[PDB]
């Protein structure tokens, strides 16, 4: 059994840019220890760098279900960081595709 390597191998894939490929090994941290925060913490930090903040917000608040111990205080600190920036970015767009240059929203001709 292991957890560390699946957390140390993607530990550079995420830092390179391969965020999803990095999570693609992080996801086994949660499947091996679905009651462990760093599982969610690794997969979560990558979702910000992918901009799937929507999912990132879910990962961080999940980690806090397991931080009942001081081996997890490290991550309890993160489940509060990228938890906040994600939900403050998920859909934050003050310049979306909202333009009109043609007919009414419900014209008729017959």
């Amino acid at each position: 059994s292991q957890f560390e390597k699946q957390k140390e191998q993607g530990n550079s894939l995420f830092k390179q840019g391969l965020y999803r490929e990095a999570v693609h090994c992080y996801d086994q941290l949660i499947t091996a220890q679905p009651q462990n925060p760093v599982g969610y913490s690794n997969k979560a930090m990558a979702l910000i760098k992918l901009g799937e903040y929507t999912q990132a917000i879910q990962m961080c608040q999940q980690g806090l279900r397991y931080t009942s111990t001081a081996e997890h205080v490290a991550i309890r600190s993160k489940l509060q960081y990228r938890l906040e920036l994600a939900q403050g970015a998920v859909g934050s767009v003050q310049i979306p595709v909202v333009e009109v240059d043609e007919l009414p929203e419900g014209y008729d001709r017959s």
Binding site: S41, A74, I75, Y81
Partner: peptide, 9 residues
């Protein structure tokens, strides 16, 4: 750097 927030574990 200035973070552990942008590190994994």
């Amino acid at each position: 750097a200035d973070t552990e927030m942008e590190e994994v574990d």
